[PDB]
Amino acid sequence: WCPRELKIDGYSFLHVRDCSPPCPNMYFRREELSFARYFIGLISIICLSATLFTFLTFLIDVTRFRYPERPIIFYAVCYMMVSLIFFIGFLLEDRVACNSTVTQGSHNKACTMLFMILYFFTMAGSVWWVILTITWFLAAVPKWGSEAIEKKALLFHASAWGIPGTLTIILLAMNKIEGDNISGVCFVGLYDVDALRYFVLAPLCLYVVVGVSLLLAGIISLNRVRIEIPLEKENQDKLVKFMIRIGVFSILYLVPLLVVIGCYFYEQAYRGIWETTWIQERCREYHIPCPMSRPDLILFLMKYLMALIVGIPSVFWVGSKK
Template identity: 90%
Template sequence: MAENIRMMQWTFCAVFSLLVQADCHSMFACEPISLRMCRDLPYNMTFMPNLLNHYDQQSAALAMEPFHPIVNLECSRDLQPFLCAMYAPICTEYGRITLPCRKLCQRAYLECHKLMEMFGVTWPEEMECVKFPDCDEGYPRLADSVSDSDPTEEAPVAVQRDYGFWCPRELKINPELGYSFLGVTDCSPPCPNMYFRREELSFARYFIGVISIVCLSATLFTFLTFLIDVKRFRYPERPIIFYAVCYMMVSLVFFIGFLLEDTVACNRSEPSIYKASTVTQGSHNKACTMLFMVLYFFTMAGSVWWVILTITWFLAAVPKWGSEAIEKKALLFHASAWGIPGTLTIILLAMNKIEGDNISGVCFVGLYNVDTLRYFVLAPLCLYVVVGVSLLLAGIISLNRVRIEIPLEKENQDKLVKFMIRIGVFSVLYLVPLLIVIGCYFYEQAFRTIWETTWIQERCREYHIPCPYQVTQVSHPDLILFLMKYLMALVVGIPSVFWVGSKKTCFEWASFFHGRKKKEMRPFHPSSLCQRSILFEFMEGE
């Protein structure tokens, strides 16, 4: 009750003092100024509640927070003393309330209002200049803060520029974590995703979850078919099995991300570390690090195994290497397929470039850092495609030459044509989704800056940060683009089913479930001219 009476007394007194410039603060005691912005003024004592009805200096400091960047940019020498006159008014031993002069208010407002618009900061109604006395004596200010500028002058030219991205206090992160966002350190993107609404994210998560289940089923079936009869899949088709294993792990990670939602990809709000829910970065989150390692490693390894598959086809088609000769290079193939992705993964871990993907729930790279996307995702994938397609075309041309120039029986001709068709279809089923993924990445990195600028422009006033200056292009990302990227990134693993999908596979699974011993296949003997060719060894088992 006493506190309510005190509040009513102060409200009445403050309004009365503003209207008639009366002295009525004698009922309150002075206290030292603790506000960071007002510690270097000629006076060091204030009183609370202040002229804006803040009952303690903590609430006054919180209300002054949006003005800090504007004061730091020094748009006006009068802004700081005027703000302090309102939020931390001088307290004399006689309890006299001293109001700032109207000219001080006008100079501060006119010189800084455009910059305030850029930061999304509004001038409080209680601070309208008409409410202050028209006096010649200014409020106590810094020694060099006197300004002789005409209150009718326009804002200085310095505010007519782009101040870049300023990290909002809600997105600031503990400096020990080493986060960065839009080139600003100790900052992280918001969760949920900064571009999409919650209902869109929910739809995307379930969409990715369903596709990951389909891909996981297809690749797992391929791998289990291989385990039933390991000797059936020899080189040059053995890389298909390892390719399927890689995408089985990729789809498993996406499925785990679907189950986890954004619990790993996002940092929950913790007052001591995170002021708001933000995107996980770096390797401090062990679960996020593990998801990243598995996803990135097997994504790159899957592409390398496809390149190795084209190499084995090339060796079988052009120099006519046999299965045994190709298998002697298996150690080199494994060293390349696992070593290259492993090296890239270690480099990214050392660079601390892991980022949470709050759309899919996993962790990857290049989601917010364009340079990382270019050098560690786009560049390797493009290199794999160029090498693989070149070898594939050379192998197909050689196979076609064999079909035309070497006389074969009608049965062998049909089998060779069938083999060529299978190679072509499998390659298209892999290449088309991969090229779409690469296209999505190129489109994303090309428009990323525009999307970020648009986001800043739309949220600058809410976050009290500088708004972009003279935005020429505004654009929002399309959810379809991201859904297509995730779809194609998972679909590339499904073509492995195409390769094992045959009558022989059905017979093997039937024998496995019925416990019957698989019958030995009658060997096929091609003509003496091509007896040692792996093409016929490969065709006869299908």
């Protein structure tokens, strides 16, 4: 049934009303959380600095970044919003998210605005990478110059902020915002089966598949030139380096995103087993009527690492130092 200490003055826990998930050792005992906490600190300095140099690049001059390769800056800012959110979660610990049960629902301002920034900026960063793929597609296959691509750019903005904008708000209609216990942030679907499957997996998967399709189209339209040039003459030692550079960029961004997607599928696959195991092994000590897999620390820490690290490739595309 429902434990007496997990009561509020209605959440989604044990499929019954007015029951809340615990805090902070429901699945992980020991100081391991803090250990993971220290580890995420070791990753924060990896992100908070890296594309900050890209910001320094955008603090050097503006006119260099033409629109076919411009949305990388919007991608960088949209993921450094996520980076600073995880940093302030580190600062505000479980105090921000555990008042003691979790901070579920739209009651306090701690989870609400933190979610509004995040979910929106994570989705915005994904859409901005999709937009960079759009610009590469339109600057590779139909050979659009870097002045007739900006005229539709506002329309792309209408799909780069409005599309997350109608998703960062529609989740509030059902009040599906929960705090995170591992790091101390607020997000969606950490304890639901439909809040995160239909609102995180589907958009990211659609973005990944369209990005891969249009980027393969761009790389094969560039391979057309790669096979046109050296058949006649020329040494063919310049565009090949550029294509392997863009390929390393694509892999170095896309692999962590697919790892995040796979970890999310792992969560949706074994969430039922995890909650059943919790029910079975915390029933005698809590004298609740009793009606086998444990979650892994290493791969959750790795998934948080992937979700925090995907802002790397924007420092890749800064080129030679000047």
